[PDB]
Design a protein around this nucleic acid. Sequence first.
DNA 1: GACCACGGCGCC
DNA 2: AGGGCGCCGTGGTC
Length: 539
Amino acid sequence: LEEAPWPPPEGAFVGFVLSRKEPMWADLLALAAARGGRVHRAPEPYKALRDLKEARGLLAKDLSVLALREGLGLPPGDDPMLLAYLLDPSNTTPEGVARRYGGEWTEEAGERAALSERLFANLWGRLEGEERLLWLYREVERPLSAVLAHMEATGVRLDVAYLRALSLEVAEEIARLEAEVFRLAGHPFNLNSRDQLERVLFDELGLPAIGKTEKTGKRSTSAAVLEALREAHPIVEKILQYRELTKLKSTYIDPLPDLIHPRTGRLHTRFNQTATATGRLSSSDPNLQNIPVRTPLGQRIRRAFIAEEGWLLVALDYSQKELRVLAHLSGDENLIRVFQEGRDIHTETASWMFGVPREAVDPLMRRAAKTINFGVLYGMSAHRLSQELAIPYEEAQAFIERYFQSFPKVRAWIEKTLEEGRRRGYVETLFGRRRYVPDLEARVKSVREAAERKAFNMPVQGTAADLMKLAMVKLFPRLEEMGARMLLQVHDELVLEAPKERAEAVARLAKEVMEGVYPLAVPLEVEVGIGEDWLSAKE
DNA sequence: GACCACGGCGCC
DNA sequence: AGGGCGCCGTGGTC
Ligand SMILES: Nc1ccn([C@H]2CC[C@@H](COP(=O)(O)OP(=O)(O)OP(=O)(O)O)O2)c(=O)n1
Ligand SMILES: [Mg+2]
Ligand SMILES: [Mn+2]
Ligand SMILES: [Mn+2]
Ligand SMILES: [Mn+2]
Ligand SMILES: [Mn+2]
Ligand SMILES: [Mn+2]
């Protein structure tokens, strides 16, 4: 390319280099743009950001987040990564996409700008004629990247002092548990080491091994194994409690307060848009899509996510999301009718596994039922179900037969999905998002059947993801108009922040947008709560 | 210091 | 014979 002075013309492709992957934390080391057979390199990258009207190129959203951090409204536009990801969701990195579609991802801005330009041309070519993939790009992914940039740059408020205090209390309890485990083992060892624990449990103590690990075939010490051994030795329950507390302390309580951004005073995640096989988003650095919620200590941690003074959090969560999507994809009349009588399958399953009335099923009971319903739906074995329910194998067998007898059109849909997947080599969501699943014709049964479960899950999980993304795209401009913020997405949940005087109106509006995003054969229902913290906003 | 594979486990 | 993720500490290499 011909070396040309900064700035570039309108519509140029940008290339940029960051000191680290997280745009809220990165130093912008270099900035370039490419167009019309020219490459333009910015003398000073921060100042040069001001000259761009749009971030167009590889990883556009990341540059847009950095610009928002610097007080500049630089929206992301075309990004070859999104084109590649729609062609084949195994396209998740610029390294791989470059090598596959006509270049090399280097560490130089100018080369990255030229690359973005060439990859865009090639990928746009590959997508001509792919009308539904093009619809997803224009109507969902490209616009969504702008929404995600705003969410990332906004961040969420955290009660840091609360978590610091919590760390000291939890440390004391961890010490109590550790001391008691060591007393029982007859000696201290590294309780965090599953290898040392394995020897203590199965060699030193007399305990029976229950299962083996996948890659190396060691005797497993997983929670499932431990729970099966709960009454074989007092040391077991102590280890399970130690595991719960250290998991929560090491993963959330200790690291999160250290991640508060000095300028915003808030916590900023990344919403990765080309990271999953199904079309879901993911969240990283830190992951805010797996904040605890199940145990009492977990709930204590979730309470640390709070609204700005004068604002409230609004949490919206699709009810029985994937079951409703299944109803639409399959057309089962019984399952559809369930959602037209306002029945709740999670509640009904919970009343059965706990042997209590439906009105006796509490939130945490109902939640327990989710792993069971989704577990059985996507191919859980009777043996496994037997083990998690602690019921005779024959009992698990009958629950799984009855589960599918009730909704007969579902198995039909599964078989149709698998057949089409074998023939075309990919499966697809309601909107035509594809996942290639080559192992559908593997000659090894375990491999083939794993592939099958992946394959028939994807249209369901991925259609739900398509709907959530579309809803975010529709909802965001309404929130901006009302002076509200979108903070987090958690697969089928959104967390918003609204001024107190407007929170009720925001909640009502957001609920309507989400419920009416794309009318299906069954209603999509949304549960919404408002609160000063994330936990109380879902209570 | 970075990076890896693994087991393990937090959420959806 | 649940699916989809990302992060932790260990054990380890470079
Ligand atoms: N153990 C789980 C939990 C969730 N999911 C998927 C399917 C549902 C989707 C959304 O998660 P939830 O909100 O927790 O499930 P829900 O059916 O929508 O339950 P709820 O009515 O309480 O929101 O994520 C799953 O595959 N396996
Ligand atoms: Mg949810
Ligand atoms: Mn904007
Ligand atoms: Mn104390
Ligand atoms: Mn839900
Ligand atoms: Mn692993
Ligand atoms: Mn799983």
